[PDB]
Amino acid sequence: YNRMKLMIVGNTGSGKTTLLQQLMKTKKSDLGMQSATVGIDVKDWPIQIRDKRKRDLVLNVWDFAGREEFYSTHPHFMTQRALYLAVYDLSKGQAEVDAMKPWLFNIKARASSSPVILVGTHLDVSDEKQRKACMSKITKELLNKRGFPAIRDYHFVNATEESDALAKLRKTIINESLNFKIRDQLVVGQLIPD
Numbered sequence: 001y002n003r004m005k006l007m008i009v010g011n012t013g014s015g016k017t018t019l020l021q022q023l024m025k026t027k028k029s030d031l032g033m034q035s036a037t038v039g040i041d042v043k044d045w046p047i048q049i050r051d052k053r054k055r056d057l058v059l060n061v062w063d064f065a066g067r068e069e070f071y072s073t074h075p076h077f078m079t080q081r082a083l084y085l086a087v088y089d090l091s092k093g094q095a096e097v098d099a100m101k102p103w104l105f106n107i108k109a110r111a112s113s114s115p116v117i118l119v120g121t122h123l124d125v126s127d128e129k130q131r132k133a134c135m136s137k138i139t140k141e142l143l144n145k146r147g148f149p150a151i152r153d154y155h156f157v158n159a160t161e162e163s164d165a166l167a168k169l170r171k172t173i174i175n176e177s178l179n180f181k182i183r184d185q186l187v188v189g190q191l192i193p194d
């Protein structure tokens with residue numbers, strides 16, 4: 001059972017829809033101005049893994065509307081066998097760290113584990129000054145110690161494009177999932193009934 005969960009969260013406007021669609025291999029000549037999610041949905045992410053012998057990993061990725069009605073009201077989505085990814089809007093500079101700061105409300109309040117990364121979206125419409133302010137504040141606040149072990153890393157991603165912008169995220173998430181253990185049991189590779 002090579003399955004693990006992932007929570008994709010952020011404040012609406014951060015661009016999660018485009019990010020996940022490009023990560024799922026959508027392309028061009030389609031709607032640019034994509035809609036925003038309501039509710040909390042889930043999709044499978046079967047990302048092939050290689051070695052001298054082929055491997056795989058399928059994530060249960062949870063699509064959370066970046067709206068309070070689908071966050072502060074649903075604490076039961078926090079778990080310890082999931083990775084966490086924040087979709088961060090770079091066009092607001094460091095102001096977005098302050099905007100994400102309150103998400104502790106569910107993340108610390110209810111036991112959770114293995115946060116991994118922040119994804120800096122809107123790279124293409126953000127200033128260098130903003131990106132510098134972002135990484136400065138992200139580090140100052142979150143990577144130092146949001147209030148819980150938010151102490152991980154980030155990538156600034158041109159989410160509209162694939163390239164390295166997305167390859168870096170796929171590599172980061174799979175490498176963490178693939179090596180994550182809960183109660184010393186690798187999540188990706190359990191022996192279960194049925």
Ligand SMILES: Nc1nc2c(ncn2[C@@H]2O[C@H](COP(=O)(O)OP(=O)(O)O)[C@@H](O)[C@H]2O)c(=O)[nH]1
Pocket residue numbers: 010011012013014015016017018019032033034035036037038064065066067121122123124125157158159160
């Ligand atoms: N320029 C640019 N636009 C983006 C990017 N990512 C997504 N989009 C915008 O994201 C909008 C969708 O809103 P969204 O925040 O994903 O709603 P949510 O599901 O509540 O989080 C789309 O209409 C696009 O205009 C990006 O990195 N660059």
